[PDB]
Each structure stands twice: as structure tokens, then as C-alpha cells.
């Protein structure tokens, strides 16, 4: 795959199109405002309430989800993943007309087919790889956040042009675009957050904190040596990969990295990751998540409360207050 | 243990002391410049060469290691770990007097007794939890980098005041100090970098990248999904612990974290970490590091050349180029 920029957006396919951003959370706000600022004709579709009035206060023609869908040619759904299906069936699906384009920033619901859009309507993706506030600020400072785009179904023949022009309008084409598919975006993103970025990482930190404190070491220092110091290392990797990080640390740290990394993350861990990937590919994770939501989030409930009781989280909070 | 600040630096024990900083790398430069800006009487001891001239350029009275040691009351050794022993025996030890204080920023060589300092000389530590340029620049902008301080032997009775006044002089007391011991700093620092921050982390990322690319996914998205996106996750952990990070990510991502984290990092991984810790405590890691250095770094050589051949490093370098 080759990375793409503003020069590669061949068609300004959003020209003359009535655009509805569904949701006015952090992400919806960033998308709609960025596009407005770029030149596009943006309205907002929300439940009446906090976000609604803030959208009107922000200067947007705001409506319900249904009427904003009726008025729109392009409808980007930026509600929370867990309410997209219900919101789509109730408010969006009855108001779609052939030749509309329906966008998402995450492939989960379309890929796993919890939502199915009629085959005379385009489904596209623009997935900026950053949080809404950063997508807005980097644009509010004319560069942006790199993004993935994809098309799930192309009824009109313009779906890829709409997705790239969306990524142009929100600033992402300034820094870089990667083409993907709904399936690859969904599965690589679920795997990355589960196996490395969020699950693996937090579990790796927690396991190291437990080894130290169970061996009798001071928890405040352990907090520094498994968590606080991580930011520096990750910043170095972000800017220059393993190579830049391993150049900047001491030779003693570097050698311990090469020697002990493979003793901690073994072949068995790589196997465990494969079983994590398999459950993403075969739909079992997606079903577990959606089932938990439908049951009233009982697993998420237990998880969140156990996590609030962790020693590292209490020690960490105190130390963060002590260091303004 | 509780966090201490400038207020807790009871005595200004560096007052009237001639201070030698041994080494003029980034760490030496930071420590010496901050202390001189703090108004301490700082000379540089380093072998003739560019460092010798860069120090003389920066306005420091600059001598050989042996000659600087002879002039100084307080001698802070900031040469690289691997040469401190030879450097100390040849150049430093002959020029120490009773009531001098010798400083380190890392306890490795004192804790494992590669270096033994006469019993009428203080041995202390001030260990900023950041790299030199950061220790320098934060000082210039009016705050600093947190630090650990410790004392290994206190001959004069002023060792601890000297360590805290050093941390105050380099800016660390602006942010927070933590008292530790030479044994705990050494063993927790070695374990943190090996099990979590450096070794664990890079092996985790690499195992994830391999699982994705061996399963057939595009290497460039995998880079984003196991590496590039980690900066945001870790910044959130740095600012507000797991709690803030888990609030900030999607519920799908957060759910996957709770569910897959413990599948990847198992009890067996925690057992692997315990064996890592044990080889730190029993001195085997230390001896293997020093033996590799004595034999001409042959293991480190192989490791470094293998690291340079990693697909994730080749694909990351291209993408980091494509995203300036």
C-alpha cells in the first residue's frame, strides 16, 4: 500500500453535496467544523439536548437524526458504536434515498453486519487516526491527523471519491491517507487495541507492577519504573522507531532490552495473540461485545470496578497530584 | 515513601564545595550547566577530545578526569556505565581525599560492587527520571525533571544533604524527589526497562506486528495499529492512569482491553518476569552485561544488527519519512 495526499484526491466529490454529520460528540464536532471550514455545506443530526443546542450555538443548521438524513446526500455516522445500529434502523434507514453515501469512522458495525445499508447507497469510511479534539486542533492549525479510508459498497461509482474528499475536507489528506478495507480496518484495529496498545500494554504494566510490589519493592518507585517512564520510551519509538529509542537509553538498558524482552514475550505469548486474532476474525469477540451490551454491560461493569481498585491506580493518582 | 520538593532540601550542602562533573555527554552537560546556572562552582573532568573542547567552549574550567578529581570536593561520575570501573580505578580513586563525596546517576556499579569507594568518602545518587537534554531544557524553562536520590555510604554525615542539594541544583526538587536506596534504584530500574518499558514493550509490539503480517494484513496499517497509535494511549496513561485512557477510547476498544489483555499477558508471563527479576537480584544479568562488554560486545553487536533487519523498522522508517 502506498500513502496518499491532497494531490491524490482526484475528484472533489463533495462539491454541491448536502452533508449531514450524525452526532456532535468530540468526533462529530471535529469532522463537521473541519469540513465547514474547508468549504463544504454541513448540517448536524442529533437528539435534542446538550449537543443539539451546542450545534445550533456553533452555527450549524441542526435537526433531528431523521430530518437531517432526509435533507442529506452524504451522511457520516459519528454516534457511539454501541448505539449506531439502533439509531440507524430507527432514524437513518427510513430516510435514505438511492445514491446517498453513508460514512463511518469505524468499520465494526458494517463489517460484522450489525448494520446493513441498501445496495443503492454508498458506504464509505474515513478513519482519522486520532481523537476528535486533535482532529479539530491540527486542522485549526492547517495540518491534520493521518487517516484510513475505505469503501464497503459502491452503488454510484463515486464512493471512493467521496471518501477521499471527506479525508481532504477534514485535514487528513494534508499529512497522509492509507487505503484499506472495512474488513482490514476493523480486524487490525480490534487486534491492535486488544493485543498491544490497550490490553497487552495495560496488562504488561500491571504484571510488572505486581512483580515488583509482590517482591517487596516500594510501589511509588515501581510506578515510575513501569508506567511514568513509559512516555519517554514511547515518544522515542513514535519519532524514530526501536532504533532511536535504543540509541537514547543507556547501553545497560539497551542490552537488558534485547536480552529480557524475548524472555517475557515468548512464542507462547505470540500464540496467545493468535487466539485473540482468531476470535476477532471469526466474529466471537464482536458477538461477546454486543451480547454484553444487550445484557446491560455486566462484564464491563465488573471490569471497570475491579480496575478502579488496582493498587497501581491509587498510587498513580496520588503521585500525579504530587507532580502538578 | 513521600515526595519531597525544594522546601525539603534542609541544608545547602553543596555550599562552598568545588564540584567536578565527570563526563560531558548529555547527562554531564545537563547536570553541570544546571548546577552552574544554580550558582555552584562546577569544573568538568573528561579526557582530551571534542567533549574536552566543547566544555571549554561552554565556559567551564575543564581538566583531565584525574586532575578534576583532585581539585573537587564533590565528584559526580556521569561517564557511560561500561567504562566507569576502569575510569574510576585509573583516574578517580588515586585523587580522592577523606570527606570527598562521589556521586552517580545510576547505582549499577556501586550496587554490584564493580566499584568500591573508600569508607571515608561519601557515595550518593541523584537520578533524574529523564534524559540529559530534558534535564537541561526543563531547568531553563523554570521547572525540571523528577529524580531519585540515595546514599550508599555516609562517611561525613552530610551525604544525604549533598544528594538532595544536588537534586535541587539540577532542577529536580522543583518537580519532586523520591528517596530510595542504591539496591532498589538499581534493581527496579533494571527490571522496569527489561520487563516492561524497553524489552517487554518492544517485544510486545513486535509480536503483534508479526501476528498481523504473518496473517496477511498490510504491513503499513499494522505499523499504525501496534506502534504509531501507542503514543496517544501512553500519553493518556501518563496523565491520568489506566482510568483516563479507558475513558478516552471507544467502548469497543475498552472492552477488548479488559477481555484480551489477560489472554495475552498470562500468569506464565508474570512468571517469566519473575525469572527476569531473579537474574537481576542474583547478579547474573549484571555479570552477563559486563562479560559481553569485556569480550568486545559480541552479543550486543548481533542484537543491534538483528534489530536493524526487522520488517517493522524498515516499514516504520518509510512511513515516518512519508509523514514529516
From Swiss-Prot, chains A, B:
Cofactor(s) named in the record: Mg(2+)
Using the record's annotation, list all stretches that form the KARI N-terminal Rossmann domain: 1-180
Q: Which InterPro entries match?
A: 6-PGluconate_DH-like_C_sf (IPR008927), KARI (IPR013023), KARI_C (IPR000506), KARI_N (IPR013116), KARI_prok (IPR014359), NAD(P)-bd_dom_sf (IPR036291)
User: How does the cofactor bind to this protein, according to its record?
Assistant: Binds 2 magnesium ions per subunit.
GO BP annotations of the record are:
isoleucine biosynthetic process; L-valine biosynthetic process
Could you tell me the keywords of this UniProt record? Answer: Amino-acid biosynthesis, Branched-chain amino acid biosynthesis, Magnesium, Metal-binding, NADP, Oxidoreductase
Catalytic center at which residues? 106
* Residues reported to bind Mg(2+) 1: 189, 193
Give a yes or no for keyword Manganese in this entry. no
PROSITE patterns membership: KARI_C (PS51851), KARI_N (PS51850)
* Top-level taxon of the source organism: Bacteria
Which one of the record's GO molecular function terms can you name? Answer: ketol-acid reductoisomerase activity
Q: What is its EC number?
A: 1.1.1.86
Annotated Mg(2+) 2 binding lies at: 189, 225, 229
Q: Start and end of every KARI C-terminal knotted domain?
A: 181-324
Q: Name the SUPFAM superfamilies on file.
A: 6-phosphogluconate dehydrogenase C-terminal domain-like, NAD(P)-binding Rossmann-fold domains
Q: Which residues bind NADP(+)?
A: 24-27, 47, 51, 81-84, 132
What does the record give as its pathway? Amino-acid biosynthesis; L-isoleucine biosynthesis; L-isoleucine from 2-oxobutanoate: step 2/4; Amino-acid biosynthesis; L-valine biosynthesis; L-valine from pyruvate: step 2/4
Protein residues bound to substrate: 250
Q: Which family does it belong to?
A: Belongs to the ketol-acid reductoisomerase family.
Record's function text: Involved in the biosynthesis of branched-chain amino acids (BCAA). Catalyzes an alkyl-migration followed by a ketol-acid reduction of (S)-2-acetolactate (S2AL) to yield (R)-2,3-dihydroxy-isovalerate. In the isomerase reaction, S2AL is rearranged via a Mg-dependent methyl migration to produce 3-hydroxy-3-methyl-2-ketobutyrate (HMKB). In the reductase reaction, this 2-ketoacid undergoes a metal-dependent reduction by NADPH to yield (R)-2,3-dihydroxy-isovalerate.
Protein's name according to its UniProt entry:
Ketol-acid reductoisomerase (NADP(+))
The record's gene field reads: ilvC
Amino acid at each position: 500500500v502506498q500513502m496518499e495526499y491532497e494531490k491524490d484526491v482526484k475528484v472533489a466529490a463533495l462539491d454541491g453535496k448536502k452533508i449531514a454529520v450524525i452526532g456532535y460528540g468530540s468526533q462529530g464536532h471535529a469532522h463537521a467544523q473541519n469540513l465547514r471550514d474547508s468549504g463544504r455545506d454541513v448540517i448536524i443530526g442529533v437528539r435534542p439536548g446538550k449537543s443539539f443546542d451546542k450545534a445550533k450555538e456553533d452555527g450549524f443548521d441542526t435537526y433531528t437524526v431523521a430530518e437531517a438524513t432526509k435533507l442529506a446526500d452524504v451522511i457520516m455516522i459519528l454516534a457511539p458504536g454501541e448505539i449506531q445500529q439502533e439509531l440507524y434502523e430507527a432514524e437513518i434507514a427510513p430516510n435514505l434515498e438511492a445514491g446517498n453515501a453513508v460514512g463511518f469512522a469505524h468499520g465494526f458495525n458494517i463489517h460484522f453486519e450489525f448494520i446493513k445499508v441498501p445496495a443503492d447507497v454508498d458506504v464509505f469510511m474515513c478513519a482519522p487516526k486520532g481523537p476528535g479534539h486533535l482532529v479539530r486542533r491540527t486542522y485549526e492549525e492547517g495540518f491534520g491527523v493521518p487517516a484510513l479510508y475505505a469503501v464497503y459498497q459502491d452503488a454510484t461509482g463515486n464512493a471512493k471519491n467521496i471518501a477521499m474528499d471527506w479525508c481532504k475536507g477534514v485535514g487528513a489528506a494534508r499529512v497522509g491517507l492509507l487505503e484499506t478495507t472495512y474488513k482490514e480496518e476493523t480486524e487490525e484495529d480490534l487486534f491492535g487495541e486488544q493485543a498491544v496498545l490497550c490490553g497487552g500494554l495495560t496488562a504488561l504494566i500491571e504484571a510488572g507492577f505486581e512483580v515488583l510490589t509482590e517482591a517487596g519493592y516500594a510501589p511509588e518507585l515501581a510506578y515510575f519504573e513501569v508506567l511514568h517512564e513509559m512516555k519517554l520510551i514511547v515518544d522515542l519509538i513514535y519519532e524514530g522507531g526501536f532504533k532511536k529509542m535504543r540509541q537514547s537509553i543507556s547501553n545497560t538498558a539497551e542490552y537488558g532490552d534485547y536480552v529480557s524482552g524475548p524472555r517475557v514475550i515468548t512464542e507462547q505469548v505470540k500464540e496467545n495473540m493468535k487466539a485473540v486474532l482468531a476470535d476477532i476474525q471469526n466474529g466471537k469477540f464482536a458477538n461477546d461485545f454486543v451480547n454484553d451490551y444487550k445484557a446491560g454491560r455486566p462484564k464491563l461493569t465488573a471490569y471497570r470496578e475491579q480496575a478502579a481498585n488496582l493498587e497501581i491506580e491509587k498510587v498513580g493518582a496520588e503521585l500525579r497530584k504530587a507532580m502538578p
